[PDB]
Structure 1
């Protein structure tokens, strides 16, 4: 037995929430006093989570609120699995690049790579996440 539908929703939400925190740290470093190690660590989280196979957390029965757990996934997500697949793979590429650039310590290159990742997060949300 795998994760229940409720567990799948909770778990995917956790991964997203934790990526969001790390994105926020990168933004803070870019706008304030840049800490290269801190940005590298944050970028490594985003890449690792992007590569963690979160598609497995969108099993049958996770399209609607379950128990006391509410989901913000739009029903269209499940009917567009081929496109969700494409965007997820694109997000992986962007996240990998952000980690690579972050390891160099170059804030200006990170700023560009950070923007590309942000655009991938946003593209998926526009299509598949309820406001």
Structure 2
């Protein structure tokens, strides 16, 4: 699916756009500004789970480009920790949505958000 580096770039941007939409639409609920519908949120976090595993296979060897920093590949073990923290947090968000527990949801949502930003601070260009 990633014939050239541009194809991997275009795939991972698309996946990261979809993840931002499915994460970011739950903001009103975790803040108390919109009623919590546990079944709907459970569905939507399942969508987000599926999508949040996708981008990483498109940052394989030789796919420099976009707004990806070179350090993604020159510090691969460190990038891998930033990716694993974020995927670990998604596991937590899934556990809270599957349980129907809003306070755990909100806490796990908070951990997700911060891991998004921690990876951006270190590996996404301005």
TM range (shorter): 0.7 to 0.9
CA RMSD after TM alignment: 1.7
What's the offset of the Cα at 1:61? Answer: 3.9
Aligned residue number for residue 123 of structure 1: 118
Where does structure 1 lack aligned partners over 5 or more consecutive residues?
A: 65-70
Q: How many residues align?
A: 124
Mean Cα displacement is larger for which, 8-17 or 83-92? Answer: 83-92
Pick from 67, 70, 88: which aligns with 1:72?
67
Shift of 1:2: 4.6
Contact map agreement 1:91 1:117 (CA 8 A) in 2: yes
Q: Distance in 1 between matches of 2:10 and 2:68?
A: 12
In 1, Cα distance between the equivalents of 2:20 and 2:2?
26
Q: Report deviation, 1:118.
A: 0.7
Uncovered stretches (5+) of structure 2, i.e. residues with no partner: none
SS in 2 for 1:17: helix
Taking structure 2 as the reference length, the TM-score comes to: 0.87
TM-score, normalization by structure 1: 0.84
1:5, 1:59 within 8 Å by CA — same for their partners in 2? no
